[PDB]
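A reminder before we start the practical. When you read a complex entry, don't treat the lines as separate problems. The point of joint prediction is that each chain is placed relative to the others, so the output describes one connected object in space. Small molecules and nucleic acid strands, if listed, are placed in the same frame. In the example below there are eleven entries. Take a minute to note the order of the lines before looking further.
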Amino acid sequence: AKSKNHTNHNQNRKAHKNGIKKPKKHKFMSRKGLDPNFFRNQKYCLKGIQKKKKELKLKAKQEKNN
Amino acid sequence: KSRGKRSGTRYKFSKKFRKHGECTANKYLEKLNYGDYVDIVCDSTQQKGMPFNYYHGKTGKIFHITKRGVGVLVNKRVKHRIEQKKVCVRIEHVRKSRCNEDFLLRKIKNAELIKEAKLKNEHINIKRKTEGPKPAAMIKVPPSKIITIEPLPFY
Amino acid sequence: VNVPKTRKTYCSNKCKKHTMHKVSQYKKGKERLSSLGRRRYDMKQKGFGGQTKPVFKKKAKTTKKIVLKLECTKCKKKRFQTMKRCKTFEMGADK
RNA sequence: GGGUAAUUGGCGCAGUUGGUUAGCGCGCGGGUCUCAUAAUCCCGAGGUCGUGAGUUCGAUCCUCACAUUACCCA
RNA sequence: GAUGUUAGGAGGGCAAAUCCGCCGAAUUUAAGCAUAUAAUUAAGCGGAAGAAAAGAAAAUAACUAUGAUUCC
RNA sequence: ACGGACCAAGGAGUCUAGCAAAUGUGCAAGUGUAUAUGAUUCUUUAAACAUUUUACGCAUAAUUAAUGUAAUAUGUCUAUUGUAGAUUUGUGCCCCACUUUGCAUACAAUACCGGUAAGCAA
RNA sequence: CCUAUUAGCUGGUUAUUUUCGAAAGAUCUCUCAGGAUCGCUGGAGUUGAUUAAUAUAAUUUUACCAGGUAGAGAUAAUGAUUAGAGGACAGGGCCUUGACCUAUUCUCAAACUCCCAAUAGGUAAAAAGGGCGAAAUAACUCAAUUUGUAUUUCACUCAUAUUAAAUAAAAUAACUCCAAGUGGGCCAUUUUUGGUAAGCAGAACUGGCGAUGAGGGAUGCUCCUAACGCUUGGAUAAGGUGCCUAAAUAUUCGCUCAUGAGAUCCCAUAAAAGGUGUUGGUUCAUAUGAACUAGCCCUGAAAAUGGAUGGCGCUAAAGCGGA
RNA sequence: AUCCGACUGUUUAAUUAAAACAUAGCAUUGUGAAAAGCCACAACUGGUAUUAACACAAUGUGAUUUCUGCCCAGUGCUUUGAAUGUCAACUUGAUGAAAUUCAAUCAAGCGCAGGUAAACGGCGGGAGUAACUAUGACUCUCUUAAGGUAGCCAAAUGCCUC
RNA sequence: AGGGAACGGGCUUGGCAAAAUCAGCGGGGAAAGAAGACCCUGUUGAGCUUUACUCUAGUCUGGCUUUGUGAAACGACUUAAGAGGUGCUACUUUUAAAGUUGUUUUAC
RNA sequence: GCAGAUGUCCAAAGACAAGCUCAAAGAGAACAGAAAUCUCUUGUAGACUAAAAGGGGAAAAGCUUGUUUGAUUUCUAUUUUCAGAACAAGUAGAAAACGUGAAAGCGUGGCCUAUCGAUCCUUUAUAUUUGCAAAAUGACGUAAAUUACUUACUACUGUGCAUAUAGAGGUGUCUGAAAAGUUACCACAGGGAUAACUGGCUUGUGGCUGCCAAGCGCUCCUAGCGACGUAGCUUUUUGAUCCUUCGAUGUCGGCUCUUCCUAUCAUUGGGACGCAGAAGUCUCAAAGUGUCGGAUUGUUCACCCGCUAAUAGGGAACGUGA
RNA sequence: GACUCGUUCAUACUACAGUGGCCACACCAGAUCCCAUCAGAACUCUGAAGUUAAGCACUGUAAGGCUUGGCUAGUACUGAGGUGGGAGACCGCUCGGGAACACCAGGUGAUGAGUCAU
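Here is the predicted structure of the whole assembly.
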């Protein structure tokens, strides 16, 4: 027999029953496919920063532990 | 039966009266930075990098910048939830959003007010005023200015 | 659809430059009786039971996708390029 | 797709390295009287392209073009 | 080769749960159905034992190699 | 619209296999003692009890069609890095702001393993 | 006998209370009486909150966006479309017939637009953050190892004592797992497509019916009030107060006489056209003549069992419109 | 008097007794025999057949009378073929180290060429035209394998149609 | 009468309504029968038909085997020579009847 | 539902750059005309842009010219449909190598919105990647040593097959079975999710009643009519719907019998007339009484013969099959 | 007075008319070279005799257009409520929002960086 083809009835009620969920909005987004030659350089920056910081901390630890 | 990319955009993607023609040269000088809000208005004169029908007139913050394009993160309502959508458009189809300008001006002005208030050791209300009921007023008006109003007859 | 017999284009194997390629049309080539699928099909078709696999007989479309065989004149390495489907296709016809 | 033949005059037609030939269709002359008909002559990319070879439509090759048989696992 | 109421013997039928040969479907599943599945099953025919059948390598491995069959 | 004249009794999500989740229990990088054996156990007992210091399953390592290859890396018995974050430590035994520590987890970033690309390739 | 074959189909499917509580959309499907998968729902659990905050919000304010529906227009374009007015290419007999141009003019468009609402929609409104500086890092960027960019570390400090606008039985949150039912819908208001129309077919928003009783509408799945543990009082809503029937034959002011009066949304039909019935207004003519106007009433107004403002009945209403 | 069936006969046991079936008559087809025709059977073997063309088998039509027209294009059935295209297994040859891969040929069938309608079946349309009108003997034209012949009819067959 | 799933015995508003019985009757009980046989749906069937798909008995034909004993003819293969065009050599034809095989006929 | 369009087309109609400006109109120039070419003026696109339509486009996205193959290989973040799966079609980028331009730049097909396809199988390309389950096959290759089962070192190792990756061969019912009919002999599971009948709503159609007045009626709109228009009633026709019934509401007509309506055919009493009488027509109150015999047809309907005073129209589940 | 590169992209456009020139723009002289064509018209190159005639600048017009305001007009339309009116079509009321065409009036630009001349 003929079928009710379509209706949006009650769909808004269903949607609002569990609220209109919002995205979680995390602090950090993955940089997988964004601006290469920039995020690679950022990787180099961060590597150098860790190298210098860790070597300073290691120098302090060695001079404090004798 | 028809759901093409540009279906139903007869008027939305049409140029305004006497405002046809390519984008102005000065628009290419617009300065864009990561994380700032941007409006998505489709410029029909530029076909490549055109946003989808839905996002025309929406706002979102930039999450990616390329040589001639911007990836902007836009909220889209899908049935029972909002979800984040990364739309990639060209420069002509994006413009700096004024959705923040009142907030930025408020920040600057309130900072330069708070500095002086703390300098003078005063307590001030920095929040916006949401002005409501007006105070009593003691107003004067010439007698030749009061005019008598009565409903008019039919004609 | 007209396509010139030769074309100066990128070589994707054994060379990484833009070299001259000779262009031709790919042909299906005959199915061999020793292929695993054909052997399995023949063994299945043996015996009683009649036809054992579907035989397609709808044949909706009328053309085929055109595939160009590009052979680099330096490394003699063949490469495939797919063209949009068309009814008439000539190679190196009059300009 | 496999195997076979064909399309050369306007018709039909067979013919292959020192070759485009004919009957019918067309044009006049002349004629044996009125026809016939000797003969000249109109009619040929020898389907199309490429290739082989002192000497090819011709020999090889590919393309679509037609007609029986036959194969029809996405 | 026959033939023998020559002498002495054997087979035949019943019974089947397990067992050994043959013959042999379709219902069903695939959400249709034809290969496939059901199933080398049911039905059918024949043949034994307290068990039957298998069994003393024309086997496996590829290792420092194992050693009939059956069953867990 | 269909079933039901009445009464009694019977009458329908169960059993097994296999998987997962949940929760409880035991042990824990191990766990389960399978088949089987022993042993003054032999009504019960067809259950209980036991197993001379690499059987097997699952887990302990992944990835690739595959030959296969296989997780920081010996400067350090340190144990990758951030932002939040529980708990802890002190100063303004009962508030909070600064320090201190930084579980779980979330979001990222890094290394490293297998495969594929690309570059080189004795 | 295989065989208790198969059935997306019909029928049935057995104690109580309590708590939570749907869908009749959507995508794919040899799919349209089915299924899977989202959505809606329960149970379980953790992380949080428990700090009249923050997260948060079917809400508003402030700031800023996007639109081309309603309306408007035809002289703004396109498409139509009625008339004339003025003014130098063509036919015949200085003239006639026009065409054409200019300025006008009547009337229109879902697939027309110069313009353009209301409603609906989006973003933002500070602490894991912002501002301002220094110092490091990079293979990035730049003419720039000191241009910029980003990151990191140090500084200083940006309302919080009401809380970077308001309001909020906002953490009754967020997340994860497992799973049921459902996937024939229908109705009302508003909008709208097809249709002459339909208790018709198809859509949009919200609310309901379903899944739900209670008071009222006499009666009624969907109307109004209002949603529900068991009671005692009080006071009301909707609606009523002549009797049926609890409460006014209440008060106050008009209108109406019907030889088929009229009498509560949905709702249970009534029209064009008329009236020298009566009531009140408006505009013209020397308290007369006219023409209008709109209240109630009347004609228009005919159907089959006997008959229905719900019934009785009601006219100094128990009718109509008020207070 | 009309329709149908010639007649006698038979039939749907329990809704149809007939115009249905059968029938004699007519016509067609196959077959000369145990290597035949038609049919049964798993095989062996068998029925017709204790038969032999005035026979057996397979069909259609359905007494008599008078007739039984045209079409072999289509589909069937059937007849001839070393001129004949196509084809399987096999066989032969070539290549290869071999598997294989390539080629080549005297089957039947189809195709080709015929025959056959008491085989299935089929069997047209426009205009113009005769001293009134009407009609069209006649003419032109398109077209088929043939264009429905002799007959018969609003028939148990004609809608329109009472 | 109303409303209601749009034709009530029950509901609402009315009309009304007085025990028990006998005999008829066919208006109603949308009376009884009986999971509608018509129609549609089902990825449920069955009978039947074909130039539906896929098969199959039968039948026609070919190959191999059974299958023995002879003769003849023809063809093919192998081998020696001649001729043709022809780059120590490569291809076509004819000549023998020389050895091998196949076919067609025929005899027992 | 409405107006349409697609299963294509293009070595340029793709890429880049430069130059130019189009349709049309007016005026002017031998042949030469409404149209043929040339010049000038105006010319916001009224042209053109492969195709449907809608957007976009003027030193261009159009026309012409020049040079080309970016219609190339690989990989991400993603948008549309949406389950936020796939295909497909796009957007923004990155790593190569190129084209174009003086360059900035632009180019990963067509100015944008459509122009298309899973598994399995096959096919052909690529590969210093692999396998064919005890082994070998380039090759005893290169160096030494002797009469051997000598020793070291080599990216490149047989046919066939299979694999990995990438295109292609197609499923148009286009998320993708290999598929003709008939049942009037029929079966089953169901369906009022769905036809054939009543009933119900609607009333186009059918029937009936109004309003206006151009005309007809010798003159005279309205005695009687009434075109062009327009307002209603009825369910006595047929439609439209599919609301109820498919575990069954007996579906035509006639006969029989009763009752009801009035939109009255006759009979009763009136009014009007284009009413002399007669006959008749229009109309009012009125449903008390009555509305027939036959031929043909199954008929309803119809049509004739005849009587009559009149032979009116309808309803009751198309009244009425225990 | 001026020029170059821009911004706004008509208050900046269009038509007609008037005024202005020393370098400044420009018209203008020429074709050997670079270059370009049918055509030194254009483009390109080399110039400096002539001229504000034009371009350009400024102004004017009961100018068209464009733009701002008023007015159209609380009109049209519209969100929420109504056991509101009306047989309906439609139309009020309460709490709110609120156009457009036309017509009238004013206006016809402003400006960033740099440079030249006096």
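Discuss with your neighbour: Residues 1-3, 32-37 of chain A lie near RNA strand J (CB under 10 Å from a C1'). What might explain this?
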